[PDB]
Design a protein around this nucleic acid. Structure first.
Ligand SMILES: [Mg+2]
Ligand SMILES: [Mg+2]
Ligand SMILES: [Mg+2]
Ligand SMILES: [Mg+2]
Ligand SMILES: [Mg+2]
Ligand SMILES: [Mg+2]
Ligand SMILES: [Mg+2]
Ligand SMILES: [Mg+2]
Ligand SMILES: [Mg+2]
Ligand SMILES: [Mg+2]
Ligand SMILES: [Mg+2]
Ligand SMILES: [Mg+2]
Ligand SMILES: [Mg+2]
Ligand SMILES: [Mg+2]
Ligand SMILES: [Mg+2]
Ligand SMILES: [Mg+2]
Ligand SMILES: [Mg+2]
Ligand SMILES: [Mg+2]
Ligand SMILES: [Mg+2]
Ligand SMILES: [Mg+2]
Ligand SMILES: [Mg+2]
Ligand SMILES: [Mg+2]
Ligand SMILES: [Mg+2]
Ligand SMILES: [Mg+2]
Ligand SMILES: [Mg+2]
Ligand SMILES: [Mg+2]
Ligand SMILES: [Mg+2]
Ligand SMILES: [Mg+2]
Ligand SMILES: [Mg+2]
Ligand SMILES: [Mg+2]
Ligand SMILES: [Mg+2]
Ligand SMILES: [Mg+2]
Ligand SMILES: [Mg+2]
Ligand SMILES: [Mg+2]
Ligand SMILES: [Mg+2]
Ligand SMILES: [Mg+2]
Ligand SMILES: [Mg+2]
Ligand SMILES: [Mg+2]
Ligand SMILES: [Mg+2]
Ligand SMILES: [Mg+2]
Lengths: 70, 101, 87, 116
RNA sequence: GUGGGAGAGGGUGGUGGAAUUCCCGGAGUAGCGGUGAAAUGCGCAGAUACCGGGAGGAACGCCGAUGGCGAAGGCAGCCACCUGGUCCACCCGUGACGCUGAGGCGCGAAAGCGUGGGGAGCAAACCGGAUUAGAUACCCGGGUAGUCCACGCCCUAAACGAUGCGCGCUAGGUCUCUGGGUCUCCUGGGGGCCGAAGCUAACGCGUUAAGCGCGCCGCCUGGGGAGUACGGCCGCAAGGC
């Protein structure tokens, strides 16, 4: 599989308002992807997690979603 | 004075009589708390990720200001008073940390 | 907090000479200011105990330098204490 | 007496029972069945066979109101959670989609001693 | 000092979604629940399951880690204010101002105590149902003090690295968090793993020492009796030293 940082551009990790790029870091559910799937670094993932939670409170990113399978 | 960022999401059903009033109310609240506004960005109608106040959308505002720090929490209290105002999040400004640079 | 504007104002006021940033009078002045920033922060917020530890370490450091000034030149010790209103 | 012909089907599967409800697209139920509605009484309700018969009983009850298209919602892990779904696709009801909506808390309530 | 840095460090206010419970309504029949099987329990006054709306309290899923912070206890939603510690680069300033530390003073998970609130979930005692030779228990259904908040006590612990603190010295390899750098790497400060010399009774430790040294404090001298008795100090008590 590919990783998120691998297929992406030069983006702002601290911008909670850019949903289009932050949607890439969420799974099928609203969960935050692990480092193995995002290809981020230690400091990067910690900053991403906080900026994702901000977008959630602004109604921009989902807290949780519904899985369509099984 | 430090530099902050204000996020306001209000009811996306207002006409221009109510939208101008709610926003000029927001201007009046910034004046009384001494917020020198640096720039503004208005997104407006945006699809929300979950229902907020039974409403699937939200009208988005964003202000970047420079104000005294002690008065921030009272400025947040003054904005949530309005019924049409739904989300008020104020964040201290930060540097645009780049990744995959 | 304590901005560098207020910082330079104290160093230049208690410097033994231009360019002095580390005199015993300068350290005690700087220590004393952060003492008062905390002792007023601890009038309210009486339940902040982890900040209370930092205060006890600054008082010890302030008294450690004053006990030193006492032994070498007791005059500048009195000139300092009278200028800061201590003890 | 309703003539819905399309609606949702919720599967609540626990280790002690598997129960099926068939509703209309708005959520209001039409009929329903469970492991106890069919003859099974005790631990036999949380078995995949009971899960299969319960799913098929509600399906034929929904045939009375005229159901053809069905959307499936599943909640809970348990024996026969999958056997109920498999019973629903072959029930004649053309299954539209299948969604897992099992409620997971964000660590909000203290569980019973059993779950710790 | 200057300039940078990371962080569930702390305190205050504010705030967000999921979930549980309960209330309201819509819809809907005959059971749900629970166990190795069951029964008490709940259900025709209409439950469980489903949709919508509302109230309340508590805890923060994913991120999350073999991770980070703190002196220890311990600290996870998010935002802001107040705030502590710490680390690096520059080689600027003072010029031995240092280390430890009997007393004292302050902190101190949980449980418990006082006053006043709060009370959703859980749950000592207790009320039941089972199991059993018996059940004063594990399992099941209920359930009060309590868990939460404010203010004041209590001072215990496997309070654990069962390893006091500070410093110097003594091969490296590898994983990592975070800084700086001439950025295959070098160089610091933490957190892991192998292992030189050496130590250890052995297991094992081994630049985070249990090695080689030095300074200072604490403490040990057979088991049961016994952390008991007496006395004292402290405590409202339980009880602690
Ligand atoms: Mg409002
Ligand atoms: Mg059963
Ligand atoms: Mg904090
Ligand atoms: Mg806090
Ligand atoms: Mg009802
Ligand atoms: Mg009865
Ligand atoms: Mg009855
Ligand atoms: Mg009755
Ligand atoms: Mg209530
Ligand atoms: Mg975890
Ligand atoms: Mg540490
Ligand atoms: Mg611990
Ligand atoms: Mg700080
Ligand atoms: Mg020099
Ligand atoms: Mg010099
Ligand atoms: Mg000189
Ligand atoms: Mg010391
Ligand atoms: Mg002592
Ligand atoms: Mg205590
Ligand atoms: Mg307690
Ligand atoms: Mg009490
Ligand atoms: Mg209970
Ligand atoms: Mg019980
Ligand atoms: Mg027996
Ligand atoms: Mg009996
Ligand atoms: Mg021992
Ligand atoms: Mg020793
Ligand atoms: Mg670098
Ligand atoms: Mg190291
Ligand atoms: Mg050897
Ligand atoms: Mg030994
Ligand atoms: Mg080893
Ligand atoms: Mg050593
Ligand atoms: Mg002793
Ligand atoms: Mg003896
Ligand atoms: Mg004892
Ligand atoms: Mg005696
Ligand atoms: Mg006594
Ligand atoms: Mg007494
Ligand atoms: Mg005792």
């Amino acid at each position: 599989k590919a990783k998120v940082k691998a297929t992406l551009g030069e983006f702002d990790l601290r911008d909670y308002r850019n949903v289009e790029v932050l949607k890439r870091f969420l799974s099928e559910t609203g969960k935050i992807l692990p480092r193995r799937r995002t290809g981020l670094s230690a400091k990067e993932q910690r900053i991403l997690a906080k900026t994702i939670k901000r977008a959630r409170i602004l109604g921009l990113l989902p807290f949780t979603e519904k899985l369509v399978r099984k | 004075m430090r530099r902050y960022e204000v996020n306001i999401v209000l009811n996306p059903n207002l006409d221009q009589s109510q939208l101008a009033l709610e926003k000029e109310i927001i201007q009046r609240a910034l004046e009384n708390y001494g917020a020198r506004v640096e720039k503004v960005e208005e997104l407006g109608l945006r699809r929300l990720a979950y229902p907020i106040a039974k409403d699937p959308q939200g009208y988005f505002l964003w202000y970047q200001v420079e104000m005294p720090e002690d008065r921030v929490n009272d400025l947040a209290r003054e904005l949530r008073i309005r019924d049409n105002v739904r989300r008020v999040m104020v964040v201290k400004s930060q540097e645009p940390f780049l990744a995959n640079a | 907090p304590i901005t560098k504007e207020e910082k330079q104002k104290v160093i230049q006021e208690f410097a033994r000479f231009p360019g002095d940033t580390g005199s015993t009078e300068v350290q005690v002045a700087l220590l004393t200011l952060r003492i008062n920033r905390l002792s007023e922060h601890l009038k309210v917020h009486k339940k902040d105990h982890h900040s209370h530890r930092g205060l006890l370490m600054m008082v010890g450091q302030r008294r450690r330098l004053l006990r030193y000034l006492q032994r070498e030149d007791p005059e500048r010790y009195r000139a300092l204490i009278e200028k800061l209103g201590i003890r | 007496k309703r003539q819905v012909a399309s609606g949702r089907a919720y599967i609540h599967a626990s280790y002690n029972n598997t129960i099926v409800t068939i509703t209309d697209p708005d959520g209001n139920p039409i009929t329903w069945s469970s492991g106890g509605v069919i003859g099974y009484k005790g631990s036999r309700k949380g078995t995949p066979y009971a899960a299969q018969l319960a799913a098929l009983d509600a399906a034929k009850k929904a045939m009375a109101y005229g159901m053809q298209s069905v959307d499936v919602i599943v909640r809970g892990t348990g024996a026969g959670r999958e056997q109920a779904i498999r019973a629903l696709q072959a029930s004649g009801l053309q299954v539209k989609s299948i969604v897992d909506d099992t409620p997971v808390p964000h660590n909000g309530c203290r569980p019973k001693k059993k779950f710790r």
